[PDB]
Ligand binder design. Structure first.
Ligand SMILES: COc1ccc(OCc2ccc(COc3c(Cl)cccc3Cl)cc2)c(Cl)c1
Ligand SMILES: COc1ccc(OCc2ccc(COc3c(Cl)cccc3Cl)cc2)c(Cl)c1
Lengths: 262, 68, 272, 262, 68, 272
């Protein structure tokens, strides 16, 4: 039925008994580069089962006060097994994804989470200096980031944070959040479903790019209807994020990249 | 090398020319080798919004229960 | 750019098919038409979406720059090519993530005496030279760079109809990116913080080069100023990935915001 | 399924996700007068969509102590939009109906409502004078009336009430209520359904009659199993009644009727 | 896409060209896609004034008595 | 736009057919021709009604507005689009109740020095921007609204032949109404008198929007004034329901009158 599914990729399987169908972004399933759209001339590496499998990133907790969370792809998976290895050993890389967000509660809980997949999800910074966010802050990895309820300008001139300041109702980029529904999405309304499943093809203005310099997709999760339970002002339910890269192919092998951190 | 297309007549004159003949056609000829120099033809097509309106894996009927 | 479907007459219903009920959690929009929830008559639809096609939406010359030159270094000016110096065209382009089109540039040139009762000059001729990223930039209004043996130049005579030229799709990628979630450099472990640092969301330091404008006539002590308003129109348009439009004021070339963060007015929940 | 439905009449639509099928009284769907059964010779008016649509009468509240409610048709709809206008402008009128009773609660509530459609639902009065109920009292309109737990004789000779005294177990007419199941009906048992839907054809010994002098159908709602909740001696759930006239045709147009009231 | 119509010659020159040939024809070609950009053809038709002059239900003959 | 019928010869009569007698009470006009009441000769008719066709009657550019701008807020002006600012075209259009046509607008631009012996300025360029009802109206002769990324603009260089553009049938109804016997609002029972009140015979508060005109050149202290005379010609014309023409002077946008109520002169009943 629309509600029961099983996803198998490599050596990993995911089962769900409360789905609300699955979304295939823009109606496009991920695919490899065709010869007619090929650019780099060298033989690509395609790890296949070693990289195209389900990786579970860290679990976040939803509370009445949560504003939202965000992650960047392939960034969030840079340290994930052999996918991360191939990402850093190659100059160029390409991949699609199957994003599976998990969140179960009970029949006496309420709340709705909007799960959006955004191509080129550029976020707003914290200073008066334009495009000032530094690489280390823009790429948090598997832990991702969070949305805020208001904009707060960083004034420390001696030691600028050079970080993002994504305000939730402004979708972290100066647009109204209610219009974010034009992007592939699903809603995890506690009275209806457990999860949200989105299949994302590779989207870019090029056939292949640098995975370290460029993040193709952004995953934004916003509480559309806040978490509430029985009468417990105190309520916490975890949100686990499991993502699997698809049709990975890398070009331009050399020595490994070791990016600067923190 | 002339391209002859027909116009979509809005307001009609009390003439039969307003309803037929070359009088409701327009002629075009490209003078430049580079396609960039060309004007816009404006005979543009449409498409199915489904990729945005219903990017669902398992196709559903509106009459039928969405959650099944 | 076509027709809309006719409304078919619809009578009463008493069935197990309920198109009114749905579940938006799936991520889909309910494709209902009036006849699904009310009794309708047959209407032969004659309205079309001819003017809302991607092409017709952009088929207008929008101002992207106002270059100024004072014929008394101001004897010549340089404008770094961009669509972000103005807000109107920029906001329309940003309804999409990627685009691919040709461009038509029209130049409206105006000039005037600064002094109401002083000076005089003969009719001016302007040279608008395109300097592709890499070509030598003029240091003086009359140095060797203005020979344009390879750079495309446009010589405009004051008073003539606005100059106009077409430019093909010149991107180095398969489409223009309105948004680039990345950097041009990756800072490597071990290098000084000064190293490997670049702007967020920026690609090339010099994407499309710039325009160098000057008056070719020998300058007279008379005080004169000229302004070249650049109008650009995307023709032969294709766009990908729609995005919600800009709701708050622009704050630079990026998606940064600062000032008008509260765009909506107050209105009673139960007030019509 | 037997449980999900949508009813559309004119510009009004009703949806339900917890139905228990629908009843079509005597297996007859409402219809217009055939030429072989026609009586008045003048051209009839058939308002169609303007009169044949869903009209929502006033909501009543069910409590542990409720005895029951009743309405009369076309009486309850006499002030309803263009249906009421046509009713009063014409000497004769005919119509069928789609009665949709609404009552939702929760999985921890109990109670069962018996919804009966009775042809010629004559009710008992309050005095020793036979057939003494006056027109104004017999025709309450959209607010209808209520059943009582016992018979109480009106003794005020100076100012007789001239009203009905419908005792519930006597079905308001001297017959046992348990036998009222011989009339088209449905039961709204809180653990099973939200509503009751009955399609009533025109029933009478004539093809057309005076809608002001005569009520063809009566709607009786009796609590078969009283309302009860968790432990709240205090419980109230509303019962909304939505009715739509069908196949309306009127004959004998003249000046409008303005009946005496209160 | 050229439309060739004939002119209604008023004053005639002492030529045979004033009475025949392409010399009494005129040529037209539309250059714009929108019909609004077009000029007026001016080959306009007429109609019966009856809707104004005789909007009578029961048609009457002038020779015959109007009031019958 | 065609031929007239020939006159057939007609001789004497002595019959029971009397076309001369009629009864105008019916609401009809007696369709007599000369041969009905007199003896006629055969005349081959060569006259035509080519110039009185609805199209030829309106095929003239009529002045509908004179917009003025003083290049020393007057640096720019706004004209609410209408055909009622002038009387000549208005009176011709009002021979009919409804109309449907395309429009051709020609702009004649003139300018001059206010001072006979002072000031000087270089050739002026004008921008005529159409602001459709809803679009932002310019507050300054140089604010962001003049970027026209979507509004249609016309840039005219002083001295060039008059500018000219065509506009399609833009009505929201199936025809333009020259007369509207109604209101845009219905006052409801109970609401304050200030409520539900609107002008008699008025439809939208902003029917067709307006034109914003300005000189693009930087203004010099010199005293200059320019005037843009707008000429409009209905082309591809269709009209419905004839009406008697305006006999007394116009008094506003409505059918209101006040002054020249006695249009006819005196003449003796028996004076030729
Ligand atoms: C996504 O939206 C875009 C993408 C690219 C753009 O600019 C690309 C660009 C590249 C070269 C030239 C050079 O054009 C010119 C030449 Cl050859 C000669 C004279 C004058 C000009 Cl003006 C002009 C524009 C703009 Cl404005 C918007
Ligand atoms: C019944 O008689 C009528 C009906 C409508 C009329 O006006 C309708 C109308 C609507 C838009 C425009 C806008 O036209 C323009 C444009 Cl796009 C660009 C530049 C200049 C102009 Cl000028 C002009 C006129 C008039 Cl003048 C008479």
């Amino acid at each position: 039925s629309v509600r029961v599914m099983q996803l198998t990729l490599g050596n990993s399987t995911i089962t769900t008994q409360e789905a609300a169908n699955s979304v295939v972004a823009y109606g496009r399933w991920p695919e490899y580069i065709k010869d007619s759209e090929a650019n780099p001339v060298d033989q690509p590496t395609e790890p296949d089962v070693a990289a195209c499998r389900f990786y579970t990133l860290d679990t976040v907790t939803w509370r009445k006060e949560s504003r939202g969370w965000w992650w960047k792809l392939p960034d969030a998976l840079k340290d994930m097994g052999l996918f991360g290895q191939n990402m850093f050993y190659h100059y160029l890389g390409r991949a699609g994804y199957t994003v599976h967000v998990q969140c179960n509660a009970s029949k006496f809980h309420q709340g709705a989470l909007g799960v959006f997949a955004v191509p080129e999800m550029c976020l707003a910074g914290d200073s008066t200096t334009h495009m000032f966010t530094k690489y280390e802050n823009a790429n948090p990895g598997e832990k991702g980031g969070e949305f805020k309820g208001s904009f707060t300008l960083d004034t420390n001139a001696t030691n600028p944070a050079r970080n993002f300041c994504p305000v939730d109702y402004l979708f972290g980029s100066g647009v109204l959040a209610g219009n974010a529904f034009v992007y592939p999405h699903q809603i995890i309304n506690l009275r209806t479903n457990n999860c949200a499943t989105l299949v994302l093809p590779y989207v870019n203005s090029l056939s292949i790019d640098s995975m370290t310099k460029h993040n193709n997709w952004g995953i934004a999760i916003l509480p559309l209807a806040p978490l509430d339970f029985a009468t417990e002002s105190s309520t916490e339910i975890p949100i686990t994020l499991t993502i699997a890269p698809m049709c990975c192919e890398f070009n331009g092998l050399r020595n490994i990249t070791v990016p600067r951190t923190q | 090398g002339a391209q002859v297309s027909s116009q979509k007549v809005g307001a009609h004159e009390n003439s039969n020319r307003a309803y037929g003949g070359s009088t409701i056609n327009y002629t075009t000829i490209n003078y430049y080798r580079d396609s960039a120099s060309n004007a816009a033809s404006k005979q543009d097509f449409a498409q199915d919004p489904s990729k945005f309106t219903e990017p669902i894996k398992d196709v559903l009927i509106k009459t039928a229960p969405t959650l099944n | 750019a076509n027709n809309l479907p006719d409304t078919q007459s619809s009578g009463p219903a008493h069935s197990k098919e309920t198109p009114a009920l749905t579940a938006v959690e799936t991520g889909a929009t309910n494709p209902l038409v009036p006849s699904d929830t009310v009794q309708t008559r047959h209407v032969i639809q004659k309205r079309t979406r001819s003017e809302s096609t991607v092409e017709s939406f952009f088929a207008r010359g929008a101002c992207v720059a106002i270059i100024e030159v004072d014929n008394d270094s101001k004897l010549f000016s340089v404008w770094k090519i961009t669509y972000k110096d103005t807000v109107q065209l920029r906001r329309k382009l940003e309804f999409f993530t990627y685009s691919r089109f040709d461009m038509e540039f029209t130049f409206v040139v105006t000039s005037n005496y600064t002094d109401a009762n002083n000076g005089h000059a003969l009719n001016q001729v302007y040279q608008i030279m395109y300097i592709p990223p890499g070509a030598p930039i003029p240091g003086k209004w009359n140095d060797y760079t203005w020979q344009t043996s390879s750079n495309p130049s446009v010589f405009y005579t004051y008073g003539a109809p606005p100059a106009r030229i077409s430019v093909p799709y010149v991107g180095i990628a398969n489409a223009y990116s309105h948004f680039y979630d990345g950097f041009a450099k990756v800072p490597l472990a071990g290098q000084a913080s000064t190293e490997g640092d670049s702007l967020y969301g920026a690609a090339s330091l010099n994407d499309f080069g710039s325009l160098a404008v000057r008056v070719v006539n020998d300058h007279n002590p008379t005080k004169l100023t000229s302004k070249i308003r650049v109008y650009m129109k995307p023709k032969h348009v294709r766009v990908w990935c729609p995005r919600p439009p800009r709701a708050v004021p622009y704050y630079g070339p990026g998606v940064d915001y600062k000032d008008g963060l509260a765009p909506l007015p107050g209105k009673g929940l139960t007030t019509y």
